[PDB]
Structure 1
Amino acid sequence: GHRPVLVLSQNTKRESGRKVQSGNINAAKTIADIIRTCLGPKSMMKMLLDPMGGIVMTNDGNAILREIQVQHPAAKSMIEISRTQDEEVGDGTTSVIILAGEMLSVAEHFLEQQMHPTVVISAYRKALDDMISTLKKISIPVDISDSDMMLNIINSSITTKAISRWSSLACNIALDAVKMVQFEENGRKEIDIKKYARVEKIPGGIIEDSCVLRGVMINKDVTHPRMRRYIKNPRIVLLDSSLEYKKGESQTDIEITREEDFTRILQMEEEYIQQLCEDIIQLKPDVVITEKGISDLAQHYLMRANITAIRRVRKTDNNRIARACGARIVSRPEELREDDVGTGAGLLEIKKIGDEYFTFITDCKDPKACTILLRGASKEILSEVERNLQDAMQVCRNVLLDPQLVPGGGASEMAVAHALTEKSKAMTGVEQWPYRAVAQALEVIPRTLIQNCGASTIRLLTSLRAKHTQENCETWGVNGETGTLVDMKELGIWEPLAVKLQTYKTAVETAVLLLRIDDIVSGHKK
């Protein structure tokens, strides 16, 4: 016997000192190196094996990072910041990771050179503030009324994905969807593309046939074949309550003693259904769409009035239809009003694609919701196309909200680095060295672009750095396709200011978070 006595429980480890900092920085560098080669217009794609047996062939950094599992907590923090960048702005996920990895890599030097992490953190925060100032300075305005400028911005956003082959069609689709989704009510502007901009993937066909509809498409068919599958100018009526006969909430029981009470009860059930159908018909609609089941007898009474019925649509699909055709979902048909009747859909067609029926409510006038019908080679191709379309729509929304633009291809990075170095020339304290280190660490984006392009990093980067020292060279970047220095006033690669601001903020703050950390303790039970 005599079991050992000790302060902390077993399986409780603890390491401290330079080892923890080095391990955290190495984990961040490994996370960066995982997706270092997936940046730029010449990025290669990666194939990821889902544990559930799926395959994710993707170029996006966030999907790659979220599809892998790590044990080191610093890698978990890096994945979390990647997800945060993806959610906040939409793109820039594989740039912020690289930036954070480089910043931690250059901070490791000062950590090893007897400098306390707090000084490094203060220098990092001053550098971040000056980066924000420089980006706000070098930005240019954009008028959202010019469709060509918006298309160019979306193209520059999607030149690095696999959809650059059909870039023109993709940009048109994304811009149209964002414009359709844009809404304002009660003075509250709203661009909510995660609910009212739906992407539907139907494998087969050709990618060139993909388009955005002026309406909503659902995978539903008429309840009864006698119903019309083609109505010219339908009057939409939406419901979210069953058209059947159902038990009440209170516990209720009948007690039948007379002979004719059973038939009377059944007849009153039928009459209740008939009354509901008559209440619906009194508005004289053309179709009825419900989120809950519709009884066969109700279907008969609806067909008697020449009304097409769709049985069970989802909540989100019903909301999209309401936004598109101008209807208003109601629960009790007794309280139906003419305002709730959905007029504005220019055509309702129920056609067959492949071996399945699909319902189209397209041709709407002024629709506030849309569906993007994607057709392609297979499921994974369509998934990647959908991810690229999400990136494009997020970029379009960011530009619509924040109409300033900054040069791409590392031109902004080099301009900010040069401005930071010029400002650091004036400081005299010990904080200047980490400040300049961050300034030059910001140059990783053009270096990675040159490395991915296959060109030589050293001389190209040196020439670019020399070029940025002149009076007006803030728009000089690199070609990701030819490996040459070009003015981005000519190449036309521009990025939203919000995306760059979010990227720099997230990278610097992740570096700050991982610099503060020491004395890792693990193994304790909840």
Structure 2
Amino acid sequence: LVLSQNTKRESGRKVQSGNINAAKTIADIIRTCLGPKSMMKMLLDPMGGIVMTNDGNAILREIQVQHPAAKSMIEISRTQDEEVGDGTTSVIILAGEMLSVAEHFLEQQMHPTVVISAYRKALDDMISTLKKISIPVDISDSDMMLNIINSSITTKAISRWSSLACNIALDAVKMVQFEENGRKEIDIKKYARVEKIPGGIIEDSCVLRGVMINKDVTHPRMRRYIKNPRIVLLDSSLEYKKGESQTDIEITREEDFTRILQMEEEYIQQLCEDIIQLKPDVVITEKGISDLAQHYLMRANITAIRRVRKTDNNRIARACGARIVSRPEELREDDVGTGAGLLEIKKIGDEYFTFITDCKDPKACTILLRGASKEILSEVERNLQDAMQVCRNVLLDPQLVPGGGASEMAVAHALTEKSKAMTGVEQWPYRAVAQALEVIPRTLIQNCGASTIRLLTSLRAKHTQENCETWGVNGETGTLVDMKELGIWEPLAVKLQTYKTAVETAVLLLRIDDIVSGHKK
């Protein structure tokens, strides 16, 4: 025994071929999932549930692997999804085909590093080219935004609900802008809560100008319907609490016991009139609520809700503009819940809910998803996540790119020109990258079901013409279509991060040349 006693090793071209095979398989298991013609994939989770979704990221996230490079690709997919939402419908496919053409230069005995340098030059030129072929677009103009969203979503199940989806996403994203950064305000996608409630139909789902609380009134008396409520956020518990410093009491005289019993009652009262001094209407807390304080608030005709999740508290506060408070004696009218157009408690069926709508200028909002069943609802919300993500990306960058593979073909002939002007050994890898790019439109074609070779040739030949870069591939017709009238547009940053992570995947995998197992630590 020398090295580690049951740690395997493998070396060289075998390792490179194995990793390339793994990457190719990873790409392959998803190649059918892309495109407006896309398939619909469903998963068997380890612990019983059912998950069905087109989105590649979730598909891969429900994959465990043994070969490592596959795990690397998995993480790559999850990163791209996190950053941009979609493109993962394409990113891993592009990376896999990139690698597949890449390996062809290994048996050329072409050492990897020079190919890597070629890839880096390729990425630089691709970024430049895409920036040259963008289109800036207004952000205020609503219907163009809706068109963008429809374009980015007409690949998953929500397509037939495109109008509702686009309106939902636009409404949600537009009204989430924390202007406190001067003119550099940032939107956030953790206040845009998504709630899945079964029953009803997709058409019933709508944007609620407020928050959803899956709780109920603590006592019968509090009114379940209020026009202009005032809201107080009590982060602290509203009841008598442990003396944190392990206090103790040693009474001697009879009255003392009943007196201390009265004292906690009195403290509860103190908190109660401290609250009511501000003339509130609504009491919210993440902690519990004493039934005695509940009594006093009832006597003041004040609605109280108990034990709500902290994130939910934050969202409510952002909804009615008030700020959370943990000290009733330190309560300030500046945190009065002004800005709640209506307080209500309905029944969805066997369960109460809390509606706080019609805020003056709500900055927080949750979306009410009402469909058929929790798994389809989860698919819907994943699609909504992707849509609202790309919408926010647009609100960060007003630059757009013609998708449908059109940009890909533009990049293709651009790199072809650079290559034929760029003599050297690295030339062949460069044009190899160019050719590898061509497969996104290809996959579009097969998922459509048309003559892939002739269609692709017509596309490429069409795109040698300088006068037009907007020629792309229609999802359903399977015919060459200029993208402008078709209107499938995408945010620039999407496709940027797409290629960028792709070539990173390429370099990271191509540098690998050996395997070692069994670390046991």
- TM-score of the superposition, structure 2-length normalised? 0.99
Distance 2:117 2:4 in 1: 37
The answer to whether the aligner puts 1:513 opposite 2:508 as a matched pair is yes
Report the 3-state secondary structure (helix = DSSP H, G, I; strand = E; otherwise coil) of the residue aligned with 1:272. helix
Deviations 1:142-181 (A, max 9, x none): 0001101100000000100100001010000001000111
Q: How far apart are 1:191 and its partner, in Å?
A: 4.0
Distance 1:470 1:218 in 2: 58
Report the 3-state secondary structure (helix = DSSP H, G, I; strand = E; otherwise coil) of the residue aligned with 2:179. strand
Report the 3-state secondary structure (helix = DSSP H, G, I; strand = E; otherwise coil) of the residue aligned with 1:111. coil
Q: How far apart are 1:425 and its partner, in Å?
A: 0.6
Alignment check: 8 A CA contact 2:77 2:88 kept: yes
Distance 2:491 2:181 in 1: 28
Report the 3-state secondary structure (helix = DSSP H, G, I; strand = E; otherwise coil) of the residue aligned with 1:130. helix
Q: How far apart are 1:190 and its partner, in Å?
A: 4.2
Deviations 1:426-484 (A, max 9, x none): 11110000000001101110000001000111000000000000012211011111100
Alignment check: 8 A CA contact 1:421 1:439 kept: yes
Match of 2:396 in 1: 401
Report the 3-state secondary structure (helix = DSSP H, G, I; strand = E; otherwise coil) of the residue aligned with 2:90. helix
Distance 1:339 1:472 in 2: 61
The answer to whether the aligner puts 1:307 opposite 2:302 as a matched pair is yes
Alignment check: 8 A CA contact 2:187 2:392 kept: no
Distance 1:192 1:51 in 2: 35
Alignment check: 8 A CA contact 2:177 2:187 kept: yes
Report the 3-state secondary structure (helix = DSSP H, G, I; strand = E; otherwise coil) of the residue aligned with 1:189. coil
Deviations 1:85-111 (A, max 9, x none): 001111111211011101110111101
Distance 2:241 2:372 in 1: 45
Alignment check: 8 A CA contact 1:176 1:212 kept: yes
Distance 2:345 2:186 in 1: 29
Q: How far apart are 1:193 and its partner, in Å?
A: 3.8
Q: How far apart are 1:188 and its partner, in Å?
A: 6.7
Alignment check: 8 A CA contact 2:231 2:281 kept: yes
Q: Percent identity?
A: 100
Deviations 1:248-293 (A, max 9, x none): 1111110011010001001111000000000000000011101100
Distance 1:345 1:472 in 2: 55
Q: How far apart are 1:62 and its partner, in Å?
A: 0.3
Alignment check: 8 A CA contact 1:16 1:518 kept: yes
Number of residue equivalences: 521
Alignment check: 8 A CA contact 1:216 1:320 kept: yes
Alignment check: 8 A CA contact 1:221 1:359 kept: yes
Deviations 1:38-97 (A, max 9, x none): 000011111110011011111100000001111110100110100010011111112110
Distance 1:360 1:191 in 2: 26
Alignment check: 8 A CA contact 1:409 1:446 kept: yes
Distance 2:183 2:240 in 1: 41
Which deviates the most, 302-311 or 85-94? 85-94
Which of 486, 499, 503 is the aligned partner of 1:504?
499
Distance 1:392 1:114 in 2: 45
Alignment check: 8 A CA contact 1:229 1:350 kept: yes
Q: How far apart are 1:194 and its partner, in Å?
A: 2.8
Distance 2:378 2:89 in 1: 19
Alignment check: 8 A CA contact 1:170 1:389 kept: yes
Distance 1:299 1:251 in 2: 27
Report the 3-state secondary structure (helix = DSSP H, G, I; strand = E; otherwise coil) of the residue aligned with 2:127. helix
Q: How far apart are 1:192 and its partner, in Å?
A: 4.0
Q: How far apart are 1:189 and its partner, in Å?
A: 3.6
Q: How far apart are 1:236 and its partner, in Å?
A: 0.8
Deviations 1:471-516 (A, max 9, x none): 1221101111110001011100111000000000001110000000
Distance 1:90 1:254 in 2: 59
Distance 2:267 2:411 in 1: 72
Alignment check: 8 A CA contact 1:38 1:94 kept: yes
- TM-score of the superposition, structure 1-length normalised? 0.98
Which deviates the most, 242-251 or 432-441? 242-251
Report the 3-state secondary structure (helix = DSSP H, G, I; strand = E; otherwise coil) of the residue aligned with 1:110. coil
Distance 1:75 1:109 in 2: 20
Match of 2:120 in 1: 125
The answer to whether the aligner puts 1:48 opposite 2:43 as a matched pair is yes
Report the 3-state secondary structure (helix = DSSP H, G, I; strand = E; otherwise coil) of the residue aligned with 2:497. helix
Distance 2:168 2:188 in 1: 13
Alignment check: 8 A CA contact 2:228 2:340 kept: yes
Gaps of 5+ in 1: 1-5
Alignment check: 8 A CA contact 1:291 1:313 kept: yes
Q: How far apart are 1:238 and its partner, in Å?
A: 0.6
Which deviates the most, 190-199 or 78-87? 190-199
Distance 2:186 2:77 in 1: 23
Alignment check: 8 A CA contact 1:236 1:285 kept: yes
Alignment check: 8 A CA contact 1:11 1:524 kept: no
Distance 1:383 1:186 in 2: 34
Alignment check: 8 A CA contact 1:178 1:191 kept: no
Alignment check: 8 A CA contact 1:195 1:320 kept: no
Match of 2:241 in 1: 246
Alignment check: 8 A CA contact 2:208 2:365 kept: yes
